[PDB]
Amino acid sequence: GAMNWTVDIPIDQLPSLPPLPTDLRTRLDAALAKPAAQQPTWPADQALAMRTVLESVPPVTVPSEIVRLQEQLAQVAKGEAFLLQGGDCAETFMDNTEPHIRGNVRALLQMAVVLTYGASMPVVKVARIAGQYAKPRSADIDALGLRSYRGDMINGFAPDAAAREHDPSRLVRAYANASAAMNLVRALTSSGLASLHLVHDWNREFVRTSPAGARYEALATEIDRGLRFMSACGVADRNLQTAEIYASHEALVLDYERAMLRLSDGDDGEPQLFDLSAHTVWIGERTRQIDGAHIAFAQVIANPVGVKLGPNMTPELAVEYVERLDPHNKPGRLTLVSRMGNHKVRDLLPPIVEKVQATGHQVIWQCDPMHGNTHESSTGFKTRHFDRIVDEVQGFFEVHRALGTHPGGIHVEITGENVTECLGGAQDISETDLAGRYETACDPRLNTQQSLELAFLVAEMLRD
Amino acid sequence: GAMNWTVDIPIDQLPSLPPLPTDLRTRLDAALAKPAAQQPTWPADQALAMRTVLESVPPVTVPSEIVRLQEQLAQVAKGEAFLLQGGDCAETFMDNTEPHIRGNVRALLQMAVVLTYGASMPVVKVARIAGQYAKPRSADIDALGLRSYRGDMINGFAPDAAAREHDPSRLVRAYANASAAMNLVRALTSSGLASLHLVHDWNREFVRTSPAGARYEALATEIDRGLRFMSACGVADRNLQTAEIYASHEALVLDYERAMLRLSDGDDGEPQLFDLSAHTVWIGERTRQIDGAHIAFAQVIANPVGVKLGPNMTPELAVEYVERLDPHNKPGRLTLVSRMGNHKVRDLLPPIVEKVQATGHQVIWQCDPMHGNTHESSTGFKTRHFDRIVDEVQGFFEVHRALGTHPGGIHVEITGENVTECLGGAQDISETDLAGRYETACDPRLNTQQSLELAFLVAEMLRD
Amino acid sequence: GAMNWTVDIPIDQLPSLPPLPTDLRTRLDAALAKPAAQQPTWPADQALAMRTVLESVPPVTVPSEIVRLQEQLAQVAKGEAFLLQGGDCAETFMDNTEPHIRGNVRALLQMAVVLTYGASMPVVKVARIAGQYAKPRSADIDALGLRSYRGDMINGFAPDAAAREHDPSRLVRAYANASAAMNLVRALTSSGLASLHLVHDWNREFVRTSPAGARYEALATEIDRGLRFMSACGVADRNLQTAEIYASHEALVLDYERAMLRLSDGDDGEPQLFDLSAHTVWIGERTRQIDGAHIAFAQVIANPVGVKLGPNMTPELAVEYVERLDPHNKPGRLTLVSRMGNHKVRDLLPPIVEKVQATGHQVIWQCDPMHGNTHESSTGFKTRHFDRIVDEVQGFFEVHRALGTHPGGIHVEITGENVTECLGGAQDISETDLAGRYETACDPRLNTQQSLELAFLVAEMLRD
Amino acid sequence: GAMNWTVDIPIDQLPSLPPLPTDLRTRLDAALAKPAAQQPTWPADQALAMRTVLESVPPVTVPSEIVRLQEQLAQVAKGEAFLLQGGDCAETFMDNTEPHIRGNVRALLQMAVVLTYGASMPVVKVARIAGQYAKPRSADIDALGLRSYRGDMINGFAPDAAAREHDPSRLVRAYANASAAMNLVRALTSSGLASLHLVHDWNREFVRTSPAGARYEALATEIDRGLRFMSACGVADRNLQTAEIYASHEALVLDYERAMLRLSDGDDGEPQLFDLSAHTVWIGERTRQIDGAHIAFAQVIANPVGVKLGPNMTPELAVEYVERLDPHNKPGRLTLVSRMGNHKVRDLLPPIVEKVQATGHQVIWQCDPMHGNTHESSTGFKTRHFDRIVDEVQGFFEVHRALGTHPGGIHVEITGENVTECLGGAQDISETDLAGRYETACDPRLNTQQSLELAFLVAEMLRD
C-alpha cells in the first residue's frame, strides 16, 4: 504494498505435467550447452523455478496453427504469396491494452489489404506481438549510467536501479501478458474488425486527412472499386476465410523459449518439439552466432524461423544458416531477413541471394528496411528517416527483380497510434516534433499514417 | 520478485481511463451500493488496487461475440435451437492446463453433436470455463473447522487456515488464468479438434468401452450415418460454421465483475456496459436476492444472463426476475435455470412456466439437473446419483411437452477426465469407488463417460 | 424432297394435356379480342392446329426462373443493380448454331464483367435469344417487290415468293430452335465459359488487337487487378453463384406467345399465367397500342415486361403504360425502354421520367441506343453510326444524373462475330466496308469489338 | 408447310463444316464400315439428308459436362461413389411432356437421396432420357404380323403397317424431342425441385400411402433426421452442389450418333470426338458384336460408355471388351452392365468379375436387374416380377461382397407415374391389374412406388 503503489501477485506453485521425451530432451540439452549471447543475468535457481511454472501453462499457440503457417510460408517462398510482418519494437506490459493491441492489429490489416491488391497474391500476416518482450542491447551501461533496459521480460523501462535488476518473475509476467494479448488478437481477427468492408473508411479517412493524400487517392480508389466489384459478384464476408494474424517475436531469452516447448499430437504424423510461445520466431543480428545456442535452439524446433542479416553478412555464412536451419529442404521453413541500410542493400544483398539460391533451397527473402537505417537526432532521440526506410525496400525490390528471385516480404516496426518517432513521411515529422509523442520503449516505429503510406508505396513497387 | 515467488505490478504508472456516461455511472454505483451476499472479506483498499490492475488488461471476451451469442440464444428461446452449458463446478488454477481444458472442450463438443442429432436443431455451446473461480457456500466454517473454501478467486483449497484467508491478489491470478484458458479454447475451436468427423471415433470408442455400449450403439451408428450422409452430399469442413464455444461463469465476486466492465462503441446505437470477463454469466441460488447487488448488477450489463431457480421459487417471483432482467422483451436475454430435485421438478416447475409464459416474454428454460440432487455418501463424499440426474431432465421434458413449451437446454457439471465423483452410470460407480479419483474442488462432476451417456439419454428425450 | 434439297419433317399430332383454368382462359380471351397489329396472315385453322401442338410441349423456361429474374429486376429498379440486354436483332434458324450462340453468350458475359466493374453493382444478363424470331415491318412490300420478311417464325429471308409466304409450321420450327438454343445457353452458363477467369484473356486480346486499345488498357488492367485481388482473398470459381443468362424476345406473334402460356405450381403462392417461351418479353414500338392485344396480353402474364418508347412518346401515355402494366406497384415488373435518337434523348426523355417517377411506381429505365439511330448508307445498307449509339447512352445518363433517377440498363443489338454492320468504332468501319460481312437478317448489330468497346465506354459513364 | 403437317428445312444453304483431323476421319470411317446389327432400313440418300441437318444443330450436351461425368464415374469405379441410372425403356414423342419428364426427374432424385444415405457416399444420377428413342428387337415381325416397333427414332408405335415403316425424318424429330427434354431437365435440376428438403414430404407421402409403409418407416425417419441434422449444422441449399442429372441412352442408331459427333478444342490436349447427343451411352446386348460397328464406334468417342452383359457372357470376352474400350486404363471410362437373371447372377457373375479385376483396369460394375427377368403373362403382357428384380440386385451384392469388389450401381427402368407394368411390390400388382395402366412402348417399368421401394431395399443392401 500500500506504501509503494505496487501489488505483489503470488505465483502459484503447481504440479508438473509429464516431462518431454528423454530423447528430445537429450538433443535440446546438447543444443543449450552452446554459449548464448545477450542473456539475462538472474541466478540459475530462480530461472529454473520460473521455467518450471511455465512448463505446465496453456500454450500461447498450438501446433496445427504452426503447421498451417508453414504451408502459407511455403507459398511465399515459391513466389506465390507475400509476407507482411510488423508491430512494436518492444511490447511493454503497461501498453499491453485493448486499444493498443486493436490499433496494431488494425494497422496490420490495413497494410495487408493494400499490399494484397498491389501484389495480386495473398499476404500472410505476422504480428510482432504476444511475446516481443526482450531486447538485446549494444551497451551494458546506458547514458544515465544504469544497467540497460532489456525489455519487460527481463527488467523495467523506468530509469532507476531497482527497476533495472534482472528479475525472472518477469518470465511469468511475460507469459500472462502474451496469452492475454493473443486471446485478444484471436477475438479481434474473427470480429467485424477483420472484414474487408472496413477498409472503405480506413483508407478514405487516411486519404482525406493526409498531406500527400492526393498522391494515394488513385490507388485507394482502385482498391475501393476492387472491393465493390467482388461484392457485386456475390462475395459476402461469410464467403471468405477468417482473417489470420500470426504471432512472432525474437527468440532471445532461452529460459522463456525452452519453458514454452511442447510435443505435438503425432496425429499429424510424428511428434516433434514446437515452441508454443509463438507461431514463428527469429534470431537477431546479435545472437546469430553459427555455433551459439540461439541457432542451435532454432534447429531443434519445428516452427518456421527467421535470421536477421546485417551488413557484415557474407554469402558463405548465409549458406551455413540455410544448411543448419533448412536441412530437410522445406520451402519457407527459413526466412532470411535483410537489414542492410538503404545505401548498402543494392551492393551487399545480390551476392548473398545468388549464393543461397544456388544451394537449391527455397528461403523467403524478407526486407527489414528499419534496423539498418537508425540514427540519433540532434535533439537526442533514436530515430529513422522515412525516406531511407522506403529507399531500402526499393533497393531490395531492385536486387530481386535483377536476379529473377522473389522479393518475399517486409518486416517493419509500426504502431497504430499517432506517435512521433520516425522523421518524415507525409506529415513531415521534424527533429523538434519527435519530442511530442516519442512513446517507444526501444526503436522508433512508423506511426499509423507512416506505415499506411509505406504500404501504398510498396504496393506501387509490387505493381512493376 | 522471483525470490518472494511474486509478480510485482506498479499501479502509479497506470492512468487514465475515460469516464462512463453519467447515467451508466449512476446506475452502476446504485447497483453496487445494494446488499451483496457471499462476498469475499478482504480490505477495500487492497481490492481497489487489484481492480485498478484489471481495469486496463485485454478483456477475456469482446462485445461483438456477446451480441452474436445473444442472437443465437434468441433462437433457443424461440424453440429453434438447444442450449448446452457445461464444465467444472470449480475451475482451479492447479488444473488450468492444456490436457484438462482440451478434455473439457472435447466432452462438450462430443455431447453437442449427439444433442444436435437428437434435437434436429443447432446446439449452442457454453462452457463453464475461463472464470468459474468463485463459489458461494452454505456455511462459513467447513467440517474441519476451517473457513470454507470459496474457489481460487477467493482462497486456497488446501486444508489449512493460512491458505483459507481471503486474498485479493487472487482477483488478478483469476484473470491471468481465465485469459490463458480462453486463449486456448479459441485455438482449439478453430483446430481439427472441432471437426465433426472426429466424432466417429470418439463415439465409437465410447460405445466399445462402455459397459452399456450395446444400449447406445444404434444411436451412435445413426449419427455416424448422418455425418457420412452430410459428407456424401458434398459438405466438407470448409463449408461449415467454425465451432463456437462461449465462456460463462457465476457472476459472484462483484470486485471482479465490475473491474472487467467495458463500455461498447456506437455500433448498436447507445453505448452499453458489457461484462468482458465472459460471454454470459448467471446469478446463483444464494445471491439472487431480488433487491440485492447481483440482480441489480445484471440489470446494468448487456450480456445474456441466467438465474438459478431452486425449489422454493414461486411463479410470482419468477415473473419479477423476468420483468427486471428482460425489461425490453428481448428473446434470449434471460435464461431461467431450473434446479428442483428429480422428485420435485414435475410438481414445482409447471406453475412457474405457465406464469412466465403468460407475460409474453421469451425466456430460455434450462434444466440444471445437478444442483438439486446432491447428497452426502456414507464414505463422506459430496455426491450425486446418475439416475436422479437423468430423472430430473426427464421430468423437465415432461413438464414442457405437457405445456407445449420449449425445453431449451441443460446446464451440467462435467469433466473430460475419468473421475469418480457421481455414483452410478454404466460404470456403476459405487460409494467405495468414489475414493479412487475424487478430484473436484467443490461439487461432483459427471466424468467423460457419464457426460456422454447423459447426452445420449437426453438425445432420446429430444426424439421422443 | 430429294429434288428440292429440302426435308419435310412431320409434325407429330399428340394428345393434349388438361386445358388452362376456365377463369384464366376467360380473361385471356377478353384480352385477345383486342385488335393486334403486325400479325401474320396465315389462316385461322392452321394457326389453331399449330398452337395446339405447342400447348403441350416442354416449356423453354420455368416459373421459378421467372420469379428469380423478377427479384433481380426489382434490385435494378431500386438502383442497386444494372440491366444488360443484348443479342441478335433477328435470330435465324440457319445461324442458330453452337458457334453463333456461344459467340453471343461470350460477348454478353464479356460486356457484363466490364459493366459490373464500372457500375460497382450486379449486372443482370438478358439475352435476345431463344425466340427472337419475329419482326414487325414498316412496309408490306420490300424494295424487291416482295412481301416483307417478318422473321423466321413467320416466313423466310430468301428473296422469293414461296419463301415469303406466312407459314404457321414455322411456329413449331421456332419452338424447336428456341428450346435447342436455350438448352445450349444453360449448358454454356454452367461451363468454364462463364468463369470470370476467362476475362483475363478476352479483354487482353481485345486490348492487344484493337486500334484504340491504348484508350481501354487502363480500365482493362484495373479489372484484371480487381479479379486477381479477389482470387488473392481466397475467392475461387466454386465460391461464386452460377452465371445466369436469361432469355428474352419481342412478344409479337400472339399465336406463339399464347400457345406457350402455362400455369404455375401454386407451391410459390397462387397459380397465375406465365409465358414460358422466355423469361422476359417486351412490346415493340409498332405494337404498343394502349388498347391493343399486345399490351393486354402483357397485363395477363406474370413475366417481367418491357415497352419500347420512341420519340413520339408523351409523358401521359407513359403513365398509362405504368398503370396498365404495373397495377400492383411491383418494382422491376415494368421496364420502359428509351429509344429516342441521340439528338433527341436529352430533350424528350426528362419530361417522361419526371411524370412516371411522380406516380410512385418503380420502373426500370433502360436505354436502347440503337433503334432510334438507324439510316441507309449511300451503298444501300441499313446501318448505324457507333458514335451516335454511344452519344445516346451518354445523353440517357445525363438525363438521369440531372434528375437523381437510376439509369437502369442498356438494350443493344450485338453479335460475337466480326461483322461489318455498324459504321465506326475503333475499327473505323466505313460505308464501303459494310459489304464484306453484312450478315444480319434485319437491323445492323454491333460486332464483337464494337460491343466490347461500347461496354468500356458505358463503364466510364457509370464511374461518374 | 402447315397444310401438310410438316416442317420444311432447306439443306442447300447449310455448309460448310471444318474437316476432322485426318486420323479421326480414318478411324470413324473404319468404325462405320463394320457390320452393324439392328439398324433401320431407310434409304441412304434420305439418311444423309437428315444427318446433314443434325450436323449443325446445337448439341444436346457439351464436352465439359462429359469430362465432369467421367471424373465422377472414376470415383464410382474406385469404390467411392454409387451410380444410379434410370428412366423409360422407350421414351416416346407422345409422352415427352413437362409432367412426364418432371415425374421421371423426381423419381430419380427421390431414389438418389435414399441410396446416398444407404451408401454413405455420393450417388451419380444418369437418366435414360433426352434420346432413348431407338430399340433393338428380338424379331423383325411382331405378334400382329407387323414390322416390329423399334422406337420413335425409327417408326411409330401405332399397330398399322404405314406407321411401322422406317422413316428417316424421325432422326430430326428425335433430336428436337431430345433437346427440348434436356432443356427442361436442366431447368428442373436448378429449380427448387432438386432441393434435398423436398425429400421429407416425398418419402413421408410414400410411407403413408404404401401398403408396406411400416416396413420402410424406420429408414425414412432416419433419412429425415439426417437431413435435419445437416441443416442444424448450418448447411443450407446455397452451400450444396447444384443437382446434376446426366443424359444417357443406348447408342443404337448409328445415323443419329454419327451426326451428333462434335470435335472438342485444345483444353485436354488432343482434339477428340465427343458424341454430344448424350453424356454417356451404352451398347446393348444385341449390338455388342466385338468386331461390329457399335463397339468400334464406342472406341472412337470420348464419352464414358457401358456394355450390357447377358447370361452368355464369358470372362474372356468381358476382358476383351475392357481392353478394347478402356485401352488407356481410365477408371470410369467403362461400365459393365450385368443383366443375368436373378436365378443366374450368383453363378455367372463371379468368374467374370475375377478375370476383369485381374487385368488391373477399374470398370464400374453396374447391375441391370430388369432385362434378364422378363416374362410373358397369361393376359399377354410383357412383364417382370418385382421379387425377381430385387433378388437379382441382392445376388449382385453378394457376388461383390464375396470378392471384395465394388457393387458400383444399378440400371433400372422406371417412371414417375402410377403404371401397372411390373407385377408385385407392396401394391401386389396382379396379372389382372396389368390391364389398367400398361403404358410402356416397350419393356415394363417400375412405377413411382415400386422404384422407391426398390431404392429402400437397395439402401438396406448397401448398409448390410
Ligand SMILES: O=C(O)[C@@H](CCCCCOP(=O)(O)O)OP(=O)(O)O
Ligand atoms: O452453479 C453452481 O456450482 C452452484 C453454486 C455452487 C454451490 C456450492 C455449494 O456447496 P456446499 O457449501 O453446499 O458444499 O449453483 P446454485 O447457485 O446452487 O444453483
Ligand SMILES: O=C(O)[C@@H](CCCCCOP(=O)(O)O)OP(=O)(O)O
Ligand atoms: O436397355 C434396354 O432397354 C434393352 C434393349 C431393349 C430390348 C428390347 C427387347 O424387346 P423384345 O423384342 O424382346 O419384345 O437392353 P439390353 O440390350 O437387352 O440389355
Ligand SMILES: O=C(O)[C@H](CCCCCOP(=O)(O)O)OP(=O)(O)O
Ligand atoms: O528486431 C529488433 O528490434 C532488433 C534490434 C533490437 C535491439 C535494440 C537495442 O538497440 P541498441 O539501442 O541497444 O543499440 O533488430 P536486429 O538489429 O537484430 O536486426
Ligand SMILES: O=C(O)[C@H](CCCCCOP(=O)(O)O)OP(=O)(O)O
Ligand atoms: O427490337 C427491335 O428490333 C425493334 C425493331 C424491329 C423492326 C425491324 C423492321 O424495321 P424496318 O426495316 O421494317 O423499318 O425495335 P423497336 O423499333 O420496336 O423499338
Ligand SMILES: [Cl-]
Ligand atoms: Cl483420464
Ligand SMILES: [Cl-]
Ligand atoms: Cl399418376
Ligand SMILES: [Mn+2]
Ligand atoms: Mn527494433
Ligand SMILES: [Mn+2]
Ligand atoms: Mn456446482
Ligand SMILES: [Mn+2]
Ligand atoms: Mn432491331
Ligand SMILES: [Mn+2]
Ligand atoms: Mn428395356
